[PDB]
Amino acid sequence: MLNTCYRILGLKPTVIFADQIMYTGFAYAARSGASVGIDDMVIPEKKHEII
Amino acid sequence: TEFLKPRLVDIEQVSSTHAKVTLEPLERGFGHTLGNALRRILLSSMPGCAVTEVEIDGVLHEYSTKEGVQEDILEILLNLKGLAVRVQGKDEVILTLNKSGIGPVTAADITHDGDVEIVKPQHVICHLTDENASISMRIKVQRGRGYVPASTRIHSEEDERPIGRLLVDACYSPVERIAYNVEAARVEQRTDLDKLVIEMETNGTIDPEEAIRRAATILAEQLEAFVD
Amino acid sequence: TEFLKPRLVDIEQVSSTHAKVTLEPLERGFGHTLGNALRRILLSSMPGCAVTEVEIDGVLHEYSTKEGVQEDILEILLNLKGLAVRVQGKDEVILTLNKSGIGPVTAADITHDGDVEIVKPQHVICHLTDENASISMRIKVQRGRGYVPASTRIHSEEDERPIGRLLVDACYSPVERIAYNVEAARVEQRTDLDKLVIEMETNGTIDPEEAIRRAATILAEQLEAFVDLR
Amino acid sequence: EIKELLKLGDLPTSGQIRLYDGRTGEQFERPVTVGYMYMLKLNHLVDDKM
Amino acid sequence: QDVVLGLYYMTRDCVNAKGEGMVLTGPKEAERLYRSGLASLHARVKVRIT
Amino acid sequence: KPLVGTGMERAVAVDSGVTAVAKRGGVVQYVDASRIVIKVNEDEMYPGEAGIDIYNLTKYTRSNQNTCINQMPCVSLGEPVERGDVLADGPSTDLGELALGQNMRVAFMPWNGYNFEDSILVSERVVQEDRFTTIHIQELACVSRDTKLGPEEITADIPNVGEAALSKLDESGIVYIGAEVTGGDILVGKVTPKGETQLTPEEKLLRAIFGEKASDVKDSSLRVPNGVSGTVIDVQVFTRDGVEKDKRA
Amino acid sequence: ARVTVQDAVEKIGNRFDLVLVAARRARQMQVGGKDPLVPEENDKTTVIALREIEEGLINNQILDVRERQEQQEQEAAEL
Numbered sequence: 017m018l019n020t021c022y023r024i025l026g027l028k029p030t031v032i033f034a035d036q037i038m039y040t041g042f043a044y045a046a047r048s049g050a051s052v053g054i055d056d057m058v059i060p061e062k063k064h065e066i067i
Numbered sequence: 068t069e070f071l072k073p074r075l076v077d078i079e080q081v082s083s084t085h086a087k088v089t090l091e092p093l094e095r096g097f098g099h100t101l102g103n104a105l106r107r108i109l110l111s112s113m114p115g116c117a118v119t120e121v122e123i124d125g126v127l128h129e130y131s132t133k134e135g136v137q138e139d140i141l142e143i144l145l146n147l148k149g150l151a152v153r154v155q156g157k158d159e160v161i162l163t164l165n166k167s168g169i170g171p172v173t174a175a176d177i178t179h180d181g182d183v184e185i186v187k188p189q190h191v192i193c194h195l196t197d198e199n200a201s202i203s204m205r206i207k208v209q210r211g212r213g214y215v216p217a218s219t220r221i222h223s224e225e226d227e228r229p230i231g232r233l234l235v236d237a238c239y240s241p242v243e244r245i246a247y248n249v250e251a252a253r254v255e256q257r258t259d260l261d262k263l264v265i266e267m268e269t270n271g272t273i274d275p276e277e278a279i280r281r282a283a284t285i286l287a288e289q290l291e292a293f294v295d
Numbered sequence: 296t297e298f299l300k301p302r303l304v305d306i307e308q309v310s311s312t313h314a315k316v317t318l319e320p321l322e323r324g325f326g327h328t329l330g331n332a333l334r335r336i337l338l339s340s341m342p343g344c345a346v347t348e349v350e351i352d353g354v355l356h357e358y359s360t361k362e363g364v365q366e367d368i369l370e371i372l373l374n375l376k377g378l379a380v381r382v383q384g385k386d387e388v389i390l391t392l393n394k395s396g397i398g399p400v401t402a403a404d405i406t407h408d409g410d411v412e413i414v415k416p417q418h419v420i421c422h423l424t425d426e427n428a429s430i431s432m433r434i435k436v437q438r439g440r441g442y443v444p445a446s447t448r449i450h451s452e453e454d455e456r457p458i459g460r461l462l463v464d465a466c467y468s469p470v471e472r473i474a475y476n477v478e479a480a481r482v483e484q485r486t487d488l489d490k491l492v493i494e495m496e497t498n499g500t501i502d503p504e505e506a507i508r509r510a511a512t513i514l515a516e517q518l519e520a521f522v523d524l525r
Numbered sequence: 526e527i528k529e530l531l532k533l534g535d536l537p538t539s540g541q542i543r544l545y546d547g548r549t550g551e552q553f554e555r556p557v558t559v560g561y562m563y564m565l566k567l568n569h570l571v572d573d574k575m
Numbered sequence: 576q577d578v579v580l581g582l583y584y585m586t587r588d589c590v591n592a593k594g595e596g597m598v599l600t601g602p603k604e605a606e607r608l609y610r611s612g613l614a615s616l617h618a619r620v621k622v623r624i625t
Numbered sequence: 626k627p628l629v630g631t632g633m634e635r636a637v638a639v640d641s642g643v644t645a646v647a648k649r650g651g652v653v654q655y656v657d658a659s660r661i662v663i664k665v666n667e668d669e670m671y672p673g674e675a676g677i678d679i680y681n682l683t684k685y686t687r688s689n690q691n692t693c694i695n696q697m698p699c700v701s702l703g704e705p706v707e708r709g710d711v712l713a714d715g716p717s718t719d720l721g722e723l724a725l726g727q728n729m730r731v732a733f734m735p736w737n738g739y740n741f742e743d744s745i746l747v748s749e750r751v752v753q754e755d756r757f758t759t760i761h762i763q764e765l766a767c768v769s770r771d772t773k774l775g776p777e778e779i780t781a782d783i784p785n786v787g788e789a790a791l792s793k794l795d796e797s798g799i800v801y802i803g804a805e806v807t808g809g810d811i812l813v814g815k816v817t818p819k820g821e822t823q824l825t826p827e828e829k830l831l832r833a834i835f836g837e838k839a840s841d842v843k844d845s846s847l848r849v850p851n852g853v854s855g856t857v858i859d860v861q862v863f864t865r866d867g868v869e870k871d872k873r874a
Numbered sequence: 875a876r877v878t879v880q881d882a883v884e885k886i887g888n889r890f891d892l893v894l895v896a897a898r899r900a901r902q903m904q905v906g907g908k909d910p911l912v913p914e915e916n917d918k919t920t921v922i923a924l925r926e927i928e929e930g931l932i933n934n935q936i937l938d939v940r941e942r943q944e945q946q947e948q949e950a951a952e953l
Contacts, residue, residue, distance in 0.1 A: 027880040040585075041578030042738035044616075046546075048584040049553025049734045053541050054527075068342060068440070070516060075524045090520070096339050097517055099548040104332040105521070110611050111324045114296065141598055145623065149600040213324070214611050218594060223487075236597075244603035256451075268603055276525055283521035285298070286514075289325060292302045292318075293511030331550025355803030356856045358685045358760075360658040365698060367658050367685075397702075424656045424702045442753045449805065458793075458803050464755060475550075544732060551612075558733040563627040565726035566757050568690060572852075576742065577735040 073263070078276060084268070086275040091262040092252040098261030102247030105265065108282040111213035113240030115272060116154045118147040120207035121233045129233045135200025136193055143193050144235045147206060150174055151186030151241075153272045158210045164192070167201035177206065186271045211239045242278060244268030301325070304490070306504055312496060314503035319480040319490030326491045330475035333493065336510040339441055343469035343500055344382050346375040347448075348389075348435035349461045357461050363428020364421055371421050372463050378402055379414035379499035380436045387437045392420070395429035405434065414499025439467040469501035589617030596620065626719040627728060634723035641723075643715030645680045645696055650708035653700055659684065661698050661712050669708060682713050685762065685858060692716075693760030727756050763855065767813035767847035775818035777845070779871060783814050784840050790848075797873035800857050807854035811846045819843040875924040876917075882927040891934060892927065899923040899932050 017037070022030045060066075071094045079087040093101070121144060125133055129140045138146070154160050160183050166176040172195060175188035193202055217234040245267045252260030267275045299322045307315040321329070349372060353361060357368045366374075379402075382388050388411050394404040400423060403416035421430055443465040476492040495503050528538045536542075541556035592615035599605050599622040608614035627634060638644055645661070649669045655662040660681040670676030682696035699714045699721075700706060711721035718724055729751065739746045751757060769777040781791055781798040790811045793804045798814030806812065818841060824832065832838040862874040875882060879892070886892045900919045902908040911932075912925040926932040 028878050031878065037582065038578055038738070041581035042735070043581065044585045045577040045581030045735040046737050047554060048581065049544065049555045049557045050580060050584065051541055051555065051558040051733050053539055053558045055539060070513075072517060073520050075520060078525075094340075094517075096335060100332050100335045100514075101517060101521070103549050104328050106610075107324060107328050110607065112322075145598050145600060214607060214613070216594070216597075216608075216613060218597075219613065238600075238604070238607075243601075244606055279521060280525060283518045286328070287518050287522060288298055288300055289329060290511045290515045290518075291300055294508050295512035295515070327550050334550070335547075355801070356858060358856065358858045359803075360684055362657065362659065364658050365656055365702070367695065367697065370697075422702075442749070444753075456805070458801055464753070466753070544734070553734065559730060561628050561728045562731045563629055563726060563728040564731075566759060568692075570759075577738050577740075580735065 080275075083274070084271050085266070087264070087266050088275075088279070089262065089264060092254055092257075092260050093263050095257070095259045095261055098249035098263050099247075102249060102263045102265060104286065105279065105282050106245050106247055108285055109242045109245045109267060109278060110240065112285065113242055113273075113278060113282065114210065114212035115239035115241045116152050116208050116210045117237030117239040118144075118150055118152070118206055118235045119209045119237050121147055121204055121235055122207075122231060123202070123204040123233070126204075126233070127231050133200075133202070135195060135197035136202065137196055138193055140233070144233055146190070146192045148236050148238055150190055150192065150206075151270045151272055152208045153184045153186060154182065154208060154210060155184065156182040160208050162206045162208065163204075164206060165201070165203045166195070168195065169198045170195055172202060183208075209237070211237065213240050214238060238270075241270045241273035242267060243270055297322075299488070301329075301491070303504075303507075308503065311499060314495055316493045316495065316503060316507055317490050318493065320482050320485060320488040321477075321480075321491055323487050326477040326489060330477065330491055330493070332514060333507070333510055334473050334475055336513050337470050337473050337493075337495070337506065339468065340513050341468050341470050341501060341506060341509065342438060342440040343467045343498070344380050344436050344438045345443075345465040345467045346378055346380070346434055346463050347437040347443075347465050349375055349432055349463055350435075350459055351430070351432040351461070353431075354461070355459060361430070363423060363425035364430065365424055366421055368461070372461060374418070374420045375434060376463055376466050378418055378420070378434070378436075381412045381414055381500045382408075382410065382436060382438060383412070384410040387435065389433055389435045392430070392432045392434060394423070395426075396423065397426045398423055400430060411436075437465070439465055441468050442466060469497045469506065470495065471498065472496040585616050587617060588619055589615060592618040594618050594620070599623065626722055626724050627726075629728070630722065635721045638715065638718040638721055638723040639711060641715070641718075643694075643696075644711045644718050644721065645682055645713035647706050647708050647710050647712050648678050649676070650706055650710070651676075653702065653704050653706060653712075656698050656700065656702040656704075658698070661700070663706060663712065680712060685760070687762040687764055691761050691763050693762055695760075761855070762858065763853070765812065765847060765850070767815055769815060772818060774820055777815055777817045778842065779813060779815055781814050783811075783816055783844055783846060784842065785837075785844065786811075795873055797871035799860055799862075799871065799873045802857055802860060804857050805855070806849045806857060808849050808851045811848045812857070813847040815844075815846045816842045817845045875921055875928050879924055882924045885927055885930055886933065895932060895934055895937060896920065896923040896927060898937055899926060 018030055018034055021033050025033075071092065073090045073093040076089045076091055079089070081087065123133070123140065123143075126140060129144060131140060133140065136143075152162075160180055162177050162180065162183065164172070164177045166172050171191050172193040173188060174185045174190040174192060176192075177185060179185060195202065214237070216236045220234065221228070245265065247263060247265035249261045249263055251258075252262040254260055265279075267278060269275050269278060299320065301318050301321050303316070304319055305317045307317070309315065318329075351361070351368065351371075354368055357372055360367060364371075380390075388408055390405045390408060390411065392400075392405045394400050399419055400421040401416060402413050402418040402420060404420075405413060407413060423430065445462040445464045448462055448465075473493065473495050476494070478490055478492055480489045482488055493507065495506065497503070497506065527540075531538060531540060539556060540560055541558045543552060544557045544559065545552050594608060594614035595618050597608070597614065597618070597620045599608070599620060601623055605614070605620070605622055609616060614620065639646060647663060649663075649665040651663055651665040651670070653661060654664045654677065660679065663678050663680075665676040665678065682698065684695060686694045688694055694716050696713045696715060698712065699719075700710075700712055706712065711718075714720070736746050767779070769779050771777070779798050781794050781796060783791070783798070790809075791814075793800050793806065794811060794814055795801060800806065800810075800812050819839075821841060824839075860873075862871065864870050864874055882896070883889055883892050886895060900923045903910060903919045903922060910922045910926070912922060912929065914922065917925075923932060
């Protein structure tokens with residue numbers, strides 16, 4: 017997106033676009049409440065079969 | 068108690084519809100407290116008028132097709148959602164829209180009521196392609212506050228909902244978008260102060276500043292229960 | 296304008312520390328609006344009294360050891376930070392603590408002032424091991440708001456600098472934990488309209504109803520800027 | 526064994542709880558892993574490093 | 576890190592969700608339904624964009 | 626203590642030597658911040674002596690990394706104690722178990738990029754509790770040497786000094802125990818001999834303008850390192866056999 | 875000019891000859907005390923020079939014109 021924007025618009029637009037992407041990216045990452053539990057590490061039921 | 072109140076510094080009015088506001092210096096932690104509490108009332112609780120029901124002739128439902136007309140009936144309803152209307156006296160007005168021949172049907176083609184002001188008369192509502200074709204509809208505007216969709220109205224009201232009446236999502240609160248940001252207030256000794264910066268997005272019926280003033284009033288009216 | 300204001304219904308005081316406050320009826324959306332905006336003022340902006348200065352006899356600094364006492368002086372200061380005190384009249388009161396003989400020195404051993412109420416008298420301050428041992432100190436309680444550290448306070452004033460004066464981190468704000476809920480109201484036919492339960496978990500001093508009254512006051516005084524000044 | 530112990534304290538199997546943003550008051554979109562991790566203050570302190 | 580995960584979570588869609596197949600005036604009415612609490616960031620919707 | 630241990634915590638804390646442990650079990654006769662005296666049971670107690678063990682606990686003392694070492698009594702006044710139990714806890718130990726740090730409520734979720742690359746977001750409440758607050762005991766020495774020009778003095782009488790510096794010093798020129806000090810403040814007043822140095826004419830004018838002309842003895846006082854600051858907990862004086870002693874000494 | 879010096883580079887060409895012109899004009903306002911063409915707007919002599927290049931007021935050739943004007947005017951008061 018920033019490579020496209022750099023070649024179409026210029027330097028100024030990209031610098032502001034890159035920032036706004038950073039701002040919204042952090043903020044909506046925070047909203048999401050994405051996490052890491054032990055159940056999030058799904059194992060296939062057929063592992064002991066394959067081995 | 069070292070009560071430090073901010074005061075309204077500068078109101079950068081970029082347009083009558085979009086205007087920015089800087090506030091300083093606010094006491095630390097009240098940066099986001101008022102910013103959000105206000106944003107919430109301004110999104111959902113603000114009063115204004117909006118298209119609720121429409122009834123076009125030659126139309127049994129919103130999915131059907133009218134010959135000689137560019138937009139599907141859904142896309143016409145979408146244009147009426149975004150039709151700015153201010154009813155001065157009454158809480159409910161049903162406006163009539165009849166028009167024919169080749170032209171983009173604008174908001175000025177609606178018959179204006181003695182106490183009804185259509186805020187953007189050049190607002191497109193439908194496009195007539197054929198000269199032979201003509202469109203007729205009855206647009207009901209009601210007043211409320213905040214945002215009441217067709218889905219959250221069919222859930223609440225299971226009263227009269229007859230076939231052919233097209234429901235349209237109401238945008239009563241004149242506020243289209245609203246955003247508050249906070250960075251950092253530097254004073255003499257305090258440096259952990261914050262300065263609230265909200266950018267409210269209105270339609271034109273209500274002024275940015277006015278809307279904010281009303282939202283603070285509704286909040287203070289809730290504080291009447293808690294004495295001081 | 297259908298302006299529908301809530302009113303204070305019931306304050307379920309389970310304890311003097313923990314108390315529920317029910318609020319209805321609230322129009323849709325105002326439950327969470329006041330809920331959080333209040334929680335924030337009730338955490339940070341609430342005024343309360345806290346031990347600021349201590350001055351123990353036979354003590355040149357907080358790191359030293361006093362004979363006949365199980366606790367090092369730091370651990371005594373820690374206990375005084377969490378000493379529940381209510382000053383009624385003045386903003387600053389200096390209380391005296393003298394006590395001797397074998398026993399856990401409780402908060403009740405402090406000489407109560409005409410307008411000073413010690414909220415938990417059974418609160419531990421120090422443990423005397425030897426019967427021969429006696430402890431003497433001057434506990435200054437001042438009133439403030441939020442949390443004022445001893446490191447924030449040892450880099451501002453410091454006009455008189457008397458050696459033998461131990462500064463303590465002030466835990467002024469009385470509210471420890473607070474969490475608002477939203478529940479059905481079952482009023483007239485409103486259905487939509489519900490209530491707002493604010494569960495408050497504070498020290499002794501500040502009274503649940505009193506505190507919510509003060510917090511609503513602080514919010515309305517900050518709103519003067521958005522109502523009056525446009 | 527851990528999940529079994531979680532049920533003894535009336536806590537979820539998941540060890541993920543619904544948290545709410547302190548600023549806003551509204552909920553985060555999904556359950557978030559919360560619990561007690563024993564952390565350690567290393568000797569690399571910034572007063573010395575600056 | 577967080578930034579990619581955030582735009583990823585935003586853009587990606589999900590089955591129905593809250594408020595599927597609706598019709599919005601613009602990008603600002605989409606922010607209106609999300610912050611108003613009537614649509615998921617993952618709802619398939621028709622929107623007018625210029 | 627750690628809530629999620631392995632069990633080795635107690636083996637490590639005890640074998641480390643930093644915890645004061647019961648050589649013989651019995652009843653604790655006397656408990657105190659400074660020391661613990663335990664009377665021993667007859668069966669283990671030796672028949673010759675009284676059979677009362679003394680443990681004078683090592684108190685807020687410096688480490689090699691300038692960190693703190695304190696032994697607190699972890700048994701109460703007149704408590705029954707078994708042989709090989711921990712009578713007093715070390716700096717990083719709690720009821721005998723090893724306690725290197727603190728356990729706390731942690732949530733795994735991003736937050737406005739304040740936990741960007743393993744960057745960490747901590748509540749004011751942890752800083753308020755002063756629980757991750759650390760003690761740093763720090764050792765600074767003041768040496769009176771012998772230059773060609775003469776021996777160095779340690780007196781409160783120092784050329785070129787405001788009353789702000791000399792305020793916390795005593796008659797001998799040594800700071801009081803307990804006095805808080807910050808970068809610039811003099812801890813020990815040392816003054817050194819200097820030859821009668823060639824004053825530049827501009828300096829000679831300026832010294833003649835105020836009158837206060839530099840003495841033969843210059844200055845080299847031990848003063849608190851730039852930016853660092855704490856409370857004086859102790860002062861120790863080593864005088865050579867035959868040199869004049871301070872009244873502080 | 876404030877963050878972005880791309881507009882000033884597009885006006886001269888070379889990133890290097892830009893720094894050389896901007897510094898020359900910066901040094902005139904720093905010592906000589908020349909008056910700025912763009913409103914000051916409370917910025918450092920460096921940014922004033924960049925603003926003036928961005929707008930196309932200061933240039934390698936323009937600076938030589940204006941140096942020859944001040945120089946040769948004094949040479950004419952002599953001769």
